[PDB]
Recover the amino acids of this structure.
């Protein structure tokens, strides 16, 4: 929004904050607060891979989510199996993590070989793609969930990471425009 | 002809598990039995037949 040194710092701190928030989101088992079984029905906190029991007889033991449960799973159509494959693999959250890391690497490497103006464009594209990946992952996770409840802080950690990623992606493109604007300015002189 | 050449086997040993197999498919299996027993089980809990 102003100058270049402050914009650098704001962009890198935003990218790092988004990366940390998403790393916590995918690496923490606090995504859903719902009644269930942690091994009768009992309030438990769920995540992406494991769900630990809460206020139960045996508190604090996580078990892997039965993504493809046995005992007459009843099967499903191709679309539903596709959805469960994405939800179990959680590729879109992981793909968002990879895109955020690639964007962070690009913005960190933008200092080296400053004459390359397309590195910042690559970082902006990576961050925006990470935001889109976040949107897809959130939609897939909620759709799998709906197959009383409330969401944990790590689900809202990822939600805030998507907002930060797009805001950081916006700054990167603004950074791309200004430096290309400078090239036009120095060409006229 | 289809039931005789159906894989996996669709034949049921006893009507006790014949209704059970229907309930464990969510409508992916149909059991052929006497109408009087069909009406009786239909009137039993949990009304899933």
């Amino acid at each position: 929004l102003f100058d270049r040194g402050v914009q650098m710092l704001l962009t890198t701190v935003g990218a790092f904050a988004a990366f940390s928030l998403m790393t916590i989101a995918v690496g923490t088992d606090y995504w859903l607060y719902s009644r269930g079984v942690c091994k009768e029905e009992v309030m438990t906190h769920s995540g992406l891979w494991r769900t630990c029991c809460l206020e139960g007889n045996f508190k604090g033991l996580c078990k892997q989510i039965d993504h493809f449960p046995e005992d007459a799973d009843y099967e499903a159509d191709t679309a539903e199996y596709f959805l469960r494959a994405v939800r179990a693999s959680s590729i879109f959250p992981i793909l968002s993590v990879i895109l955020l890391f690639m964007g962070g690497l690009c913005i960190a490497a933008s200092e080296f070989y400053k004459t390359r103006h397309n590195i910042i464009l690559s970082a902006g594209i990576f961050f925006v793609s990470a935001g889109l990946s976040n949107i897809i992952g959130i939609i897939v996770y909620i759709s799998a969930n709906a197959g009383s409840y409330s969401y944990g802080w790590s689900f809202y950690f990822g939600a805030l990471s998507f907002i930060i990623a797009e805001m950081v992606g916006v700054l990167a493109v603004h950074m791309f425009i200004d430096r290309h604007k400078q090239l036009r300015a120095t060409a006229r002189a | 002809t289809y039931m005789r050449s159906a894989e996996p086997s669709v034949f049921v040993r006893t009507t006790a598990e014949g209704v059970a197999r229907v309930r464990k498919s969510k409508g992916k299996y149909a059991y052929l039995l006497e109408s009087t027993m069909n009406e009786y089980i239909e009137q039993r809990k949990p009304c899933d037949t």
Q: What stands out?
A: Helices of chain A lie at 5-27, 78-89, 91-109, 118-145, 153-188. The domain at 6-184 of chain A is CATH 1.20.140.150 (Butyryl-CoA Dehydrogenase, subunit A; domain 3).
